[PDB]
Amino acid sequence: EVETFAFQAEIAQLMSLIINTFYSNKEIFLRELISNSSDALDKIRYESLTDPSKLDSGKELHINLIPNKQDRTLTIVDTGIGMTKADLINNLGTIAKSGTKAFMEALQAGADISMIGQFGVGFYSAYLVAEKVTVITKHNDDEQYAWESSAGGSFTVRTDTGEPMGRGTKVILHLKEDQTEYLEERRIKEIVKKHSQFIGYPITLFVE
Amino acid sequence: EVETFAFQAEIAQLMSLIINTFYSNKEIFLRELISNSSDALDKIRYESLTDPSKLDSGKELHINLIPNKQDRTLTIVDTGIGMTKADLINNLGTIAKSGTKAFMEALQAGADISMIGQFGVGFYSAYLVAEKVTVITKHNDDEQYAWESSAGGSFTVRTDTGEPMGRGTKVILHLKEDQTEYLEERRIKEIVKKHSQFIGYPITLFVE
Ligand SMILES: CCNC(=O)c1n[nH]c(-c2cc(Cl)c(O)cc2O)c1-c1ccc(OC)cc1
Ligand SMILES: CCNC(=O)c1n[nH]c(-c2cc(Cl)c(O)cc2O)c1-c1ccc(OC)cc1
């Protein structure tokens, strides 16, 4: 049912750098994950331009933000192109090995962690606030998978038989104990307004 | 030999807005075109991860900047994934119709033209400095095409029989008469250093 994989050495090193570096401006994770959602949404939209049946799995192109104080999770859902099993395994559709190398040569040259997205590995900023991350995804050319990691050098992939989602990607952030401010409506609103004001898809902040 | 197409109404409107709006910070075009080259390069690299024969048409992943004062052109070449004929026709692989709409709702809300790339239509900033633009491209799954436009509502596409390039995209900017500062080594260097310092591919500035 569940396969376990090792992160390539460079990705594991990126993940330790994000987890262990003292760095206070953690809120940029939300921008990186929304921006990722926007890229996936752009992709399904571009595909629908020549093949409208690509949208048979859902015409709505949007991003939802769902906080849950009881489970201590912030979930980001989008109706973008989604990922195949192979995409999930190859670093969630990123060029993360070379992107990590570039990012680290910048960090030497003075840059800081807020610029991680410029190197294509913005996802991993999720580990600034999350102790575990679960990625649930559905691409038109494959079944629904769940990817999951709590860092420490490994991730899992399983075929997800739970809630079918049609098409897209759901990112569930199991928040660190001292990071529950990102479940507060006021705070999420503030971050979205600050860093994500010109995203070309509706972003709905669910309430509790 | 040569097909002529009309820009969708919204793209034509974007192109008039870029050409006719008084706006002095024109140098951002280079950043947008390099960043486009970087995205294409990321794509061929991601593809090679699972199918290394994708790089049979060239293993080198780079961006060259070639000024020519005699022809009055700045050319940007990259060895990225390239575009099929259909990509060229569908707004150079962009979601330009919806991206233009978003960009224009931002311009109402106070944003300026330097943020065009946040809406996926950064290419068209080329018309801040160029009176004509020629895009020559080669994707693994198709032949070599040349796209061309001097705005005014139309572009052409032809199958390019001239210099074969293996794989990638070449953007040739026929500069406006008052915009020849972007052929000066000092100036191009300055712009690349300012706006394009963390691009994960070597950028070579050719000399004359
Ligand atoms: C290749 C076809 N699929 C995709 O590209 C895709 N599909 N879903 C996502 C995606 C990834 C993350 Cl991490 C996220 O938070 C949201 C997403 O939609 C992505 C995705 C993958 C890689 C990215 O690198 C910047 C950004 C988004
Ligand atoms: C779908 C497969 N091909 C590509 O995506 C592609 N190939 N070459 C380019 C490209 C486009 C421009 Cl305008 C440029 O200046 C440089 C490029 O490499 C692109 C490209 C297309 C769209 C883009 O939108 C941001 C950015 C780059």
Curated annotation (Swiss-Prot), chains A, B:
Q: What does this protein do?
A: Molecular chaperone that promotes the maturation, structural maintenance and proper regulation of specific target proteins involved for instance in cell cycle control and signal transduction. Undergoes a functional cycle that is linked to its ATPase activity which is essential for its chaperone activity. This cycle probably induces conformational changes in the client proteins, thereby causing their activation. Interacts dynamically with various co-chaperones that modulate its substrate recognition, ATPase cycle and chaperone function.
So what does mutating residue 78 to A actually do?
Answer: Impaired ATP-binding. Strong interaction with HIF1A, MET, KEAP1 and RHOBTB2. Loss of interaction with HSF1 and ERBB2. Los of interaction with TSC1
Organism per entry = Homo sapiens (Human)
Q: How is it modified after translation?
A: ISGylated.
Instruction: Please state where this protein is localized.
Output: Nucleus; Cytoplasm; Melanosome; Cell membrane
For this chain, the family text in UniProt reads: Belongs to the heat shock protein 90 family.
Which stretch of the full sequence is covered here? 16 to 223 of 732
- Name of the featured protein: Heat shock protein HSP 90-alpha
What is this organism's lineage? Eukaryota, Metazoa, Chordata, Craniata, Vertebrata
What happens on changing residue 32 to A?
A: Strong ATP-binding. Strong interaction with HSF1, HIF1A, ERBB2, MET, KEAP1 and RHOBTB2. No effect on interaction with TSC1
Region described as Interaction with NR3C1 = 1-208
Residues found modified as N6-acetyllysine: 43, 69
Listed binding positions for ATP are 36, 78, 97, 123
State the domain notes: The TPR repeat-binding motif mediates interaction with TPR repeat-containing proteins like the co-chaperone STUB1.
Assembly information from the UniProt record: Homodimer. Identified in NR3C1/GCR steroid receptor-chaperone complexes formed at least by NR3C1, HSP90AA1 and a variety of proteins containing TPR repeats such as FKBP4, FKBP5, PPID, PPP5C or STIP1. Forms a complex containing HSP90AA1, TSC1 and TSC2; TSC1 is required to recruit TCS2 to the complex. The closed form interacts (via the middle domain and TPR repeat-binding motif) with co-chaperone TSC1 (via C-terminus). Interacts with TOM34. Interacts with TERT; the interaction, together with PTGES3, is required for correct assembly and stabilization of the TERT holoenzyme complex.
